[PDB]
Each structure stands twice: as structure tokens, then as C-alpha cells.
mmCIF file of C-alpha atoms and ligand atoms in Angstrom:
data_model
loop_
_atom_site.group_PDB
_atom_site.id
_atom_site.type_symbol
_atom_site.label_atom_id
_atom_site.label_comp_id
_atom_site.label_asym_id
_atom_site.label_seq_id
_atom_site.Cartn_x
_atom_site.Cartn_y
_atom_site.Cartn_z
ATOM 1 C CA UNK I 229 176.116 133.854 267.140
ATOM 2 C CA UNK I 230 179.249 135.975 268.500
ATOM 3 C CA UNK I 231 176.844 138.764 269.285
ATOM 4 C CA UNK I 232 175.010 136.698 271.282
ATOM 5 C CA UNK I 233 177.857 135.099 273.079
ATOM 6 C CA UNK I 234 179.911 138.672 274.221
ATOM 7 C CA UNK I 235 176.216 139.516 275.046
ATOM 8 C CA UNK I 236 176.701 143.039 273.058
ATOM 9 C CA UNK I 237 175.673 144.078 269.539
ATOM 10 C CA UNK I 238 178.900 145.841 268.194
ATOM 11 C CA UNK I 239 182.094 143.296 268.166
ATOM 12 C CA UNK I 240 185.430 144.196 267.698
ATOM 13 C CA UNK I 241 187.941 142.687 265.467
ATOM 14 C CA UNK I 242 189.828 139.272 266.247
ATOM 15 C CA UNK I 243 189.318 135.880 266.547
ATOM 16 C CA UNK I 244 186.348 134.570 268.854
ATOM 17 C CA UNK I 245 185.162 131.363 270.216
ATOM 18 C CA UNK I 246 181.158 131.210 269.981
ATOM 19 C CA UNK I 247 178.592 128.885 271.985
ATOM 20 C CA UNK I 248 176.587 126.124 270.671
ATOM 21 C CA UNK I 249 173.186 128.013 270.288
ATOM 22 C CA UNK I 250 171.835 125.254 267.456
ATOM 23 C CA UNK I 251 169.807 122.547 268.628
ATOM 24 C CA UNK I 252 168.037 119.481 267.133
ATOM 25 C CA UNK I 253 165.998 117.641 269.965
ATOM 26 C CA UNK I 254 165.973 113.868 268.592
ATOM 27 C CA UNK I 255 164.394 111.049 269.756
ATOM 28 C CA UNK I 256 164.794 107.825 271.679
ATOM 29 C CA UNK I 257 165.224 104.272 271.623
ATOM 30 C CA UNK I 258 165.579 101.675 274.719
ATOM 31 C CA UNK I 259 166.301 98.318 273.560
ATOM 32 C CA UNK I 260 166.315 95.365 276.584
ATOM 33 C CA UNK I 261 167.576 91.382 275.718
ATOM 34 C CA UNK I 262 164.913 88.946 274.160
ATOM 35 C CA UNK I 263 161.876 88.401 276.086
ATOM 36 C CA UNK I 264 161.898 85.187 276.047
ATOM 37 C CA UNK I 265 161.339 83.178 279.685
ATOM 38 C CA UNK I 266 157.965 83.274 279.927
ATOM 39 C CA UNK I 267 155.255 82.237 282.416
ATOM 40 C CA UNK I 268 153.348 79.702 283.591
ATOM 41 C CA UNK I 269 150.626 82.109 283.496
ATOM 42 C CA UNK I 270 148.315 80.019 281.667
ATOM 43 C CA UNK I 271 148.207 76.815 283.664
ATOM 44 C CA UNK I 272 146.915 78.694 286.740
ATOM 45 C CA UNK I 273 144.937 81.051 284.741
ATOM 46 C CA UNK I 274 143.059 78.162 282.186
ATOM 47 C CA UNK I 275 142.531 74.558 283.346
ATOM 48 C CA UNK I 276 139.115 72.822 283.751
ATOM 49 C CA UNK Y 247 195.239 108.213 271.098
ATOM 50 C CA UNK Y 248 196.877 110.864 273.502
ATOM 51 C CA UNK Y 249 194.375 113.465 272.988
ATOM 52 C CA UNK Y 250 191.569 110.855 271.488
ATOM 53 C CA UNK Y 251 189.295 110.751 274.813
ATOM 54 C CA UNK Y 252 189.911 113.907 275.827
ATOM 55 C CA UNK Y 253 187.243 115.443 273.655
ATOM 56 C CA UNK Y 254 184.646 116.148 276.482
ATOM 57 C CA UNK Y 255 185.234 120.144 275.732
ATOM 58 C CA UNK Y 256 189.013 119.968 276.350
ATOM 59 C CA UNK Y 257 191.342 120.494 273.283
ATOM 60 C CA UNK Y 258 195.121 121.460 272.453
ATOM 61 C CA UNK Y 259 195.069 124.206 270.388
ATOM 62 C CA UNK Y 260 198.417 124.160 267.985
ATOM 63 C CA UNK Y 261 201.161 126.321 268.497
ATOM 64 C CA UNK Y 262 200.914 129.586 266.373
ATOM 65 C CA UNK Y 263 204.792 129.367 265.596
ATOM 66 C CA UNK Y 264 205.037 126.093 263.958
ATOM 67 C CA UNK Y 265 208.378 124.688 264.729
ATOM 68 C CA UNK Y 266 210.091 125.340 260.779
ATOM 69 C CA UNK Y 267 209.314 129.127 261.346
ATOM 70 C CA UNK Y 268 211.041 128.956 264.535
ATOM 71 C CA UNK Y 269 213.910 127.082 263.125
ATOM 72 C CA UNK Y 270 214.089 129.827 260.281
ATOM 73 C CA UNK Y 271 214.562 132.169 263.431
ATOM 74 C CA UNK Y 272 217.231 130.386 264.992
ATOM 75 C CA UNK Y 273 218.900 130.127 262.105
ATOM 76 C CA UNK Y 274 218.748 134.213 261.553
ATOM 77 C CA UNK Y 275 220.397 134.102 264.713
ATOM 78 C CA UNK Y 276 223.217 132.153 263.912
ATOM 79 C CA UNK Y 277 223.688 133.495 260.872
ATOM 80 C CA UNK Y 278 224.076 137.204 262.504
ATOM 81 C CA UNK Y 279 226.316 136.125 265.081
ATOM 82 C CA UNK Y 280 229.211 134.689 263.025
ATOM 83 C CA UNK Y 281 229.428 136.958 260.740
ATOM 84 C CA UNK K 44 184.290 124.306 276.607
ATOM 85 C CA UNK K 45 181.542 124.424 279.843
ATOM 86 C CA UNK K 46 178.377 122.792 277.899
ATOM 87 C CA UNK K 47 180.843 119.816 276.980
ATOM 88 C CA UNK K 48 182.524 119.382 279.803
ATOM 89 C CA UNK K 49 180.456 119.742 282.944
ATOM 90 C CA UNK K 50 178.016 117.581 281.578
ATOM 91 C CA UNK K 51 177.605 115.695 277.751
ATOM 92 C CA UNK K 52 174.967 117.084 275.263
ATOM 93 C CA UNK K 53 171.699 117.339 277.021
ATOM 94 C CA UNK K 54 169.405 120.215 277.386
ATOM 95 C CA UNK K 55 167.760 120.620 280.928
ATOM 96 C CA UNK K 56 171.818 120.182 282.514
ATOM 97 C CA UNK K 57 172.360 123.611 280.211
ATOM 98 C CA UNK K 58 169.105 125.301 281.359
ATOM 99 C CA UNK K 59 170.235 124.288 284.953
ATOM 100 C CA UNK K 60 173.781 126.192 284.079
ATOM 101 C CA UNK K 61 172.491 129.335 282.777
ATOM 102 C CA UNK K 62 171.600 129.929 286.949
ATOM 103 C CA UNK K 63 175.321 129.903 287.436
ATOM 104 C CA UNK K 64 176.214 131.395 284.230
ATOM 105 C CA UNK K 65 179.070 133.629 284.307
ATOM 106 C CA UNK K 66 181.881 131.211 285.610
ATOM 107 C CA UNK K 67 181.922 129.877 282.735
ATOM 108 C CA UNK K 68 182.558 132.995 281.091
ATOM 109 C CA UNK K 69 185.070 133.733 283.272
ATOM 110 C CA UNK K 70 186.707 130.110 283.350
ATOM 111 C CA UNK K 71 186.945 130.219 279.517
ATOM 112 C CA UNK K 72 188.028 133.480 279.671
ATOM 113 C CA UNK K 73 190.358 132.810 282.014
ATOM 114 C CA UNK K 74 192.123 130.306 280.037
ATOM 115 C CA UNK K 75 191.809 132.393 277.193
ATOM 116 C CA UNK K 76 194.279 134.875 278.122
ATOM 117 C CA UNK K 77 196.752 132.035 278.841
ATOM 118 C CA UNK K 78 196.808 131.371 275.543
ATOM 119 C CA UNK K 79 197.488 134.594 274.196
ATOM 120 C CA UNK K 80 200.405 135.175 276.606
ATOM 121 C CA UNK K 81 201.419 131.916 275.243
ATOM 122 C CA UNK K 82 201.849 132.898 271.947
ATOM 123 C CA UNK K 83 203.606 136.845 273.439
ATOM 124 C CA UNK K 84 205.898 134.780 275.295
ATOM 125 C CA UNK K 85 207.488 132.795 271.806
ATOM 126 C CA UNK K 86 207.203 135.962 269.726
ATOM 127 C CA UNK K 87 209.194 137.819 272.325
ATOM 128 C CA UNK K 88 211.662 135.328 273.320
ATOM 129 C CA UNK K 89 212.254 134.454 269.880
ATOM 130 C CA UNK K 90 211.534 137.152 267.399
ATOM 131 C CA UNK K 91 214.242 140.386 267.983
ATOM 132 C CA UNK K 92 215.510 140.625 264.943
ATOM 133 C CA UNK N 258 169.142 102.604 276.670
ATOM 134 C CA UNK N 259 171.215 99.156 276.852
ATOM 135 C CA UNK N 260 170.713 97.111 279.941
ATOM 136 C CA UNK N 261 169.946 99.755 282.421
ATOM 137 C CA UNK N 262 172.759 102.055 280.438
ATOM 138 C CA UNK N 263 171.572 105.972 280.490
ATOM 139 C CA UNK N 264 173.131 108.273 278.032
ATOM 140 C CA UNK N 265 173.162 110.270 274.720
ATOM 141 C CA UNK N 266 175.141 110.007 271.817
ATOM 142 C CA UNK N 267 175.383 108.684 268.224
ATOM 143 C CA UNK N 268 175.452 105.076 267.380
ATOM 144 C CA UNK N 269 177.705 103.433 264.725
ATOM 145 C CA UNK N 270 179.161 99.982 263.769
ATOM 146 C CA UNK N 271 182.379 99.492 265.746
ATOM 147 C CA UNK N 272 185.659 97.448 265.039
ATOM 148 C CA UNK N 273 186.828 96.236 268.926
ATOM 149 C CA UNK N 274 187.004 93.054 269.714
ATOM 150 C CA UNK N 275 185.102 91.295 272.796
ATOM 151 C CA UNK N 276 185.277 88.375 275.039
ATOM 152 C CA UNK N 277 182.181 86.030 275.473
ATOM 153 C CA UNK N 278 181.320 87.459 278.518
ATOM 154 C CA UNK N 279 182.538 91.174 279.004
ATOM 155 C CA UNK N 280 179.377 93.605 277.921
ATOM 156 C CA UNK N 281 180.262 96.978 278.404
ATOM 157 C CA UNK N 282 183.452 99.115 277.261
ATOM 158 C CA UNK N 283 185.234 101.781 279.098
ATOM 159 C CA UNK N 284 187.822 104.510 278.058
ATOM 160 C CA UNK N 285 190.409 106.369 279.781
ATOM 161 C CA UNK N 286 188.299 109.020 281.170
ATOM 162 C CA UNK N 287 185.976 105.984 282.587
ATOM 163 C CA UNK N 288 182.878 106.596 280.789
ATOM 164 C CA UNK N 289 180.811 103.977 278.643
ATOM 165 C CA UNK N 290 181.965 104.553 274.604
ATOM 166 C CA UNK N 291 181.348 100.791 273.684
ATOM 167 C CA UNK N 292 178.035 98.802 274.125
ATOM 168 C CA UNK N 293 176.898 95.779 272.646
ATOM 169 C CA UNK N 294 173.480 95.048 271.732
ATOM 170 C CA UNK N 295 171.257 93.036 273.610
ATOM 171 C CA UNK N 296 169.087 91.182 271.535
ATOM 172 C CA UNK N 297 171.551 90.737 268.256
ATOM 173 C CA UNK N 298 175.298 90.825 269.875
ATOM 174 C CA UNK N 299 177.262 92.761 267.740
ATOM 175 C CA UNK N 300 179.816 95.534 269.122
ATOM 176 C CA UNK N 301 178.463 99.197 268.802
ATOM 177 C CA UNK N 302 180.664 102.536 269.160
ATOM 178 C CA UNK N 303 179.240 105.805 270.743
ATOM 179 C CA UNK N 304 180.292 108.962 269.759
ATOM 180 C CA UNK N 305 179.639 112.747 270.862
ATOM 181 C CA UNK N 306 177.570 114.590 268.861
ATOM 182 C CA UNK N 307 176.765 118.308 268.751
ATOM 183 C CA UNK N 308 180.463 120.175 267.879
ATOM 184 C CA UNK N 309 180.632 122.537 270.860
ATOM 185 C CA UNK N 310 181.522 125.588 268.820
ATOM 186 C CA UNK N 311 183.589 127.321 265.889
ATOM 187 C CA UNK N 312 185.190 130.249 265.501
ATOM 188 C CA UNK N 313 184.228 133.395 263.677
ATOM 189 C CA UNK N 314 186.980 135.476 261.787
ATOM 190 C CA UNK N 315 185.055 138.797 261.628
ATOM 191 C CA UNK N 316 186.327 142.348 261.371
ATOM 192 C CA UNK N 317 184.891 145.081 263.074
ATOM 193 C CA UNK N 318 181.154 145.519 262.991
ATOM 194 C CA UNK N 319 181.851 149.164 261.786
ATOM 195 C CA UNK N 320 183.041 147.661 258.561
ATOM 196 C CA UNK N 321 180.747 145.273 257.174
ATOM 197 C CA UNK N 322 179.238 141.684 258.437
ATOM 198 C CA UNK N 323 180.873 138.982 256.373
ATOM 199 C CA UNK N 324 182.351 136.525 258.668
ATOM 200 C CA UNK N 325 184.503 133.753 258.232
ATOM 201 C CA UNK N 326 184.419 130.140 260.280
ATOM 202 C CA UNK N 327 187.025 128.150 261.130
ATOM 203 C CA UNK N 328 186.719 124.367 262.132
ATOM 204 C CA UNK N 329 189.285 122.954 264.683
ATOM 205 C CA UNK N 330 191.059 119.911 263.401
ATOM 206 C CA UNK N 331 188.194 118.317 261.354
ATOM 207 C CA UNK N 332 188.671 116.904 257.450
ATOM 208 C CA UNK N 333 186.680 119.054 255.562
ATOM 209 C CA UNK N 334 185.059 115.957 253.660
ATOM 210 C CA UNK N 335 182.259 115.687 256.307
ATOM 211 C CA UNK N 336 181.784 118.918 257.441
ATOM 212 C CA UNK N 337 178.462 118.873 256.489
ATOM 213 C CA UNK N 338 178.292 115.771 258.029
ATOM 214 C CA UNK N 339 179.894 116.671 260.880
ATOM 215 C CA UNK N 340 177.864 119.975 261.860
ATOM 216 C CA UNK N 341 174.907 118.443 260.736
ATOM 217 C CA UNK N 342 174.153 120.891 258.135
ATOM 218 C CA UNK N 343 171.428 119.039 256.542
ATOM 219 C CA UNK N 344 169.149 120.658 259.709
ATOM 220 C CA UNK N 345 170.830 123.891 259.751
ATOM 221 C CA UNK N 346 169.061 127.494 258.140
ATOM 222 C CA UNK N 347 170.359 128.037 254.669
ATOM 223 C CA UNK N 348 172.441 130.988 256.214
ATOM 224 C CA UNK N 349 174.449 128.805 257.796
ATOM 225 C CA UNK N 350 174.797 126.271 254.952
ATOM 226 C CA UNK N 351 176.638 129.434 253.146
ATOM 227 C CA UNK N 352 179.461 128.578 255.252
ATOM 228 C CA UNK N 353 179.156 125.101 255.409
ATOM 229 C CA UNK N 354 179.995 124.467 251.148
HETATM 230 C C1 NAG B 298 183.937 152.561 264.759
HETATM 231 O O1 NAG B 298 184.518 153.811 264.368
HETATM 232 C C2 NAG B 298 184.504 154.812 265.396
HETATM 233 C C3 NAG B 298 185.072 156.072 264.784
HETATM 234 O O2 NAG B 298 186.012 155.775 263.761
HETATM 235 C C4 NAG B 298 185.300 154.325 266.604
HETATM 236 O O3 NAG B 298 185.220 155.295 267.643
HETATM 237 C C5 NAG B 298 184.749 152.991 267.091
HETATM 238 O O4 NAG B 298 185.567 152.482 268.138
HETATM 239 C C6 NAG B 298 184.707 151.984 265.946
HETATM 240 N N1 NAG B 298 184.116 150.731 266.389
HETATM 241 C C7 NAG B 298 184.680 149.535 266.181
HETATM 242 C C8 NAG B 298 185.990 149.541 265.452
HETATM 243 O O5 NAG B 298 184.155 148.495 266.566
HETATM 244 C C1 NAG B 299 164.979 87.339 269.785
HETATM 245 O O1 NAG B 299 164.283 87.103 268.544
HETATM 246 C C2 NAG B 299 165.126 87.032 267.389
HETATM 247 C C3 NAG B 299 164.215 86.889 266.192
HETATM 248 O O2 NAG B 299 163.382 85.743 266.312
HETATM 249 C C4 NAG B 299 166.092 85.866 267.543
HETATM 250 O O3 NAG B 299 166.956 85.823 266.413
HETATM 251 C C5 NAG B 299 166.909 86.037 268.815
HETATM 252 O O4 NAG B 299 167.758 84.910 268.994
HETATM 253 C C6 NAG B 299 165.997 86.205 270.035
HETATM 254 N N1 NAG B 299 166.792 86.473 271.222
HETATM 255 C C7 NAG B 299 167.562 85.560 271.824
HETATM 256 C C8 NAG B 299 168.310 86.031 273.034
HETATM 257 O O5 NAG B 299 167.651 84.409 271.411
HETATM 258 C C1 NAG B 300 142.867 80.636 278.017
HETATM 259 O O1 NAG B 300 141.826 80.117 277.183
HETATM 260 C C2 NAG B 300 141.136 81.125 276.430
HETATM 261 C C3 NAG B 300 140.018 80.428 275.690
HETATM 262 O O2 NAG B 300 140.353 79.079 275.395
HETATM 263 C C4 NAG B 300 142.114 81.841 275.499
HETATM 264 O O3 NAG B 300 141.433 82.887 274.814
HETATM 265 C C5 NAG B 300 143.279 82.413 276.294
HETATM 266 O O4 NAG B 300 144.253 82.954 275.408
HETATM 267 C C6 NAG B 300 143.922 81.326 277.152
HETATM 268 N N1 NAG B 300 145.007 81.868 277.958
HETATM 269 C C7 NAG B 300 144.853 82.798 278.910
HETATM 270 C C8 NAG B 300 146.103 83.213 279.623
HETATM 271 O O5 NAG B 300 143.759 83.285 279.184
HETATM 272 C C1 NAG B 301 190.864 114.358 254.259
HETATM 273 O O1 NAG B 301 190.195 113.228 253.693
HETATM 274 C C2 NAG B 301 190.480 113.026 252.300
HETATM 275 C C3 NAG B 301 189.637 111.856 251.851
HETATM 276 O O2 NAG B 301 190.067 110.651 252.469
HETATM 277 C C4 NAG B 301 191.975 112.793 252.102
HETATM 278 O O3 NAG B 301 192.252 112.669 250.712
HETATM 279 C C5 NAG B 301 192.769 113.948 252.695
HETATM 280 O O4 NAG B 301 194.163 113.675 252.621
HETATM 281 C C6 NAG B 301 192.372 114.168 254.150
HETATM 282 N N1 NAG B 301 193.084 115.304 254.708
HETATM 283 C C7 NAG B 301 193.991 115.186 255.683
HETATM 284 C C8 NAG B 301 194.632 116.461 256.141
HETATM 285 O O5 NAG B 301 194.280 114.099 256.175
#
């Protein structure tokens, strides 16, 4: 990981500070408030 | 607190010299001088 | 640290910064070298004998 | 995703204390670190993930390769936690315990 940061394959001695170079793509979530409110979609929609 | 949101890639590294070495120096000083 | 700071954990904002790439290297580098003259400064101030 | 709220990050149970009507939480730096949940109101905390970096104690490549890391500030209790190690190579995991 310090190789690949100075971007050379021989480092000298010391102290470095590397990059991140690890990744774990994750997944997602979206939560919204309760649905609840609903329509009057079925008195239009169903009557006789 | 003080450096509690500040960890959006910003930190304070700590002193290499931690302040009881530095004392030990100051008190090699002293110690020189008076005698 | 540049992938921290510019912008929080997310991928495509790092792909985006590898165009620009090397002010970053030379920002952190640049602070770098602060640091160590930091550190010269107390040894030689206080560290003669 | 919380009420139009766009961000990543790590969700946990939080501790801070709300008024009946306030929803979101700001910090010093103005950015959103406390969001309650929508549908069941409790309080949750957000928290960075992904340590930026370490670093490497290494002498010269000339020498040999072993390396050490060092971990700024963090109780070593949760370091695996804390990097994650559970996903890392087992390389890495040499370092990690
Ligand atoms: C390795 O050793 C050679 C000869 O001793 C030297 O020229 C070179 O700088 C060394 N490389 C290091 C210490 O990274
Ligand atoms: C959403 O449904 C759950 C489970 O039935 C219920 O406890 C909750 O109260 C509902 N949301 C609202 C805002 O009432
Ligand atoms: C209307 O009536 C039909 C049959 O009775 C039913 O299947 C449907 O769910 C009702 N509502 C709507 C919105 O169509
Ligand atoms: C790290 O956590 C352990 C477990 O709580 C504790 O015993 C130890 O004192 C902590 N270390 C520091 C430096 O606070």
C-alpha cells in the first residue's frame, strides 16, 4: 500500500502516511414516514 | 469535544516531545547553570 | 487527508479526483514538512546539552 | 435516505435528546450527524466509516519487507472492528491481531 502511494517500487526508511486503497461497496436503504393517507381511489374507480 | 467534529480528514497529531521529557530538559538546564 | 475531506466516503467523487490528482499530493505533502520542522524546531530550541 | 436526506455513513442507536418537533441534528461543522427515523421515532447517530489511512513503520526495501502499522488515537479493543477486518485479505488480518 506505501508502494502504491509514493507511486515507486523501492521505499526508503521512515514513517509514511498511506491512502485508503480498500474498499467494500455496501448497499442501500431509503426509508420514508408511514404511508398511511390514502385515496379515495375506489369510490370513483368502483360504484354501480 | 474540541477536536470531536473535526474528523472529516483533519487531525492533531501529538507533540513528539511530550511535555515531562521537556521538563526533564529544563530541569538539565537549571541544574547546569547553578552549579 | 484529501479523500476525507473534499468530499465524505463515496466512490465516483474519488474517481472524479484522480483527474486532478497531484494537489493532493502536494497539499499533504505540503503540510507534511510543517510537521517535521515542527518537531526540528523543539529539538533545537530545547535540546543543547 | 430519511426524508429527502442524501448521504453515507454508519447507523447506530444514539443517546441525544429531542424536542417534539425538531427532526434533524446538526454539528459544528454544519453537516447532518443525527436523524430520527420516520416511521418508528427513535433518535439515530451517524458516523464516518472507512478510516482514511494508517501508517507503515517499514525499513528500507533493501533490507527485508516486514512492516509495522500504527493506528492514530484508536483503543485497540475494536480495531478489528474499527478497520473492518472481518472483509479484509488474511494478509492484512496479520496486522490487525
Ligand atoms: C540499497 O543499498 C545500496 C548500496 O548499499 C544503496 O545505494 C541504495 O541507496 C540502498 N537503497 C535503499 C536504502 O533504499
Ligand atoms: C406504520 O405502521 C406501523 C406498524 O403497523 C405502526 O406501528 C406505525 O404507527 C405506522 N406509522 C404511523 C406514522 O403511525
Ligand atoms: C373494485 O371492485 C373489484 C371487484 O369487486 C375489486 O377487485 C377491486 O379491488 C375494487 N377496487 C378497485 C380500486 O378496483
Ligand atoms: C481501551 O478500552 C479498554 C476497555 O474498556 C480499557 O480497559 C482501556 O483502559 C482503554 N484504553 C484507554 C487508553 O483508554
Amino acid at each position: 500500500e506505501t508502494k502504491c502511494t509514493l507511486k515507486s517500487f523501492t521505499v526508503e526508511k521512515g514513517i509514511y502516511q498511506t491512502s485508503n486503497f480498500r474498499v467494500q461497496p455496501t448497499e442501500s436503504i431509503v426509508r420514508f414516514p408511514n404511508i398511511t393517507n390514502l385515496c379515495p381511489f375506489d369510490e370513483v374507480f368502483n360504484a354501480t | 469535544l474540541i477536536c470531536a467534529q473535526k474528523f472529516k480528514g483533519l487531525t492533531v497529531l501529538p507533540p513528539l516531545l511530550t511535555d515531562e521529557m521537556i521538563a526533564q530538559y529544563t530541569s538539565a538546564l537549571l541544574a547546569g547553570t547553578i552549579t | 487527508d484529501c479523500t476525507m475531506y473534499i468530499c465524505g466516503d463515496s466512490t465516483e467523487c474519488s474517481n472524479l479526483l484522480l483527474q486532478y490528482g497531484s494537489f493532493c499530493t502536494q497539499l499533504k505533502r505540503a503540510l507534511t514538512g510543517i510537521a517535521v520542522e515542527q518537531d526540528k524546531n523543539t529539538q533545537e530550541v530545547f535540546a543543547q546539552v | 435516505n430519511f426524508n429527502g436526506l442524501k448521504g453515507t455513513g454508519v447507523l447506530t442507536e444514539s443517546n441525544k435528546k429531542f424536542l417534539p418537533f425538531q427532526q434533524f441534528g446538526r454539528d459544528i461543522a454544519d453537516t447532518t450527524d443525527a436523524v430520527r427515523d420516520p416511521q418508528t421515532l427513535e433518535i439515530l447517530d451517524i458516523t464516518p466509516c472507512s478510516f482514511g489511512g494508517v501508517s507503515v513503520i517499514t525499513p528500507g526495501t533493501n533490507t527485508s519487507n516486514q512492516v509495522a502499522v500504527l493506528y492514530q488515537g484508536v483503543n485497540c479493543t475494536e480495531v478489528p472492528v474499527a478497520i473492518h477486518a472481518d472483509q479484509l485479505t488474511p494478509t492484512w488480518r496479520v496486522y490487525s491481531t
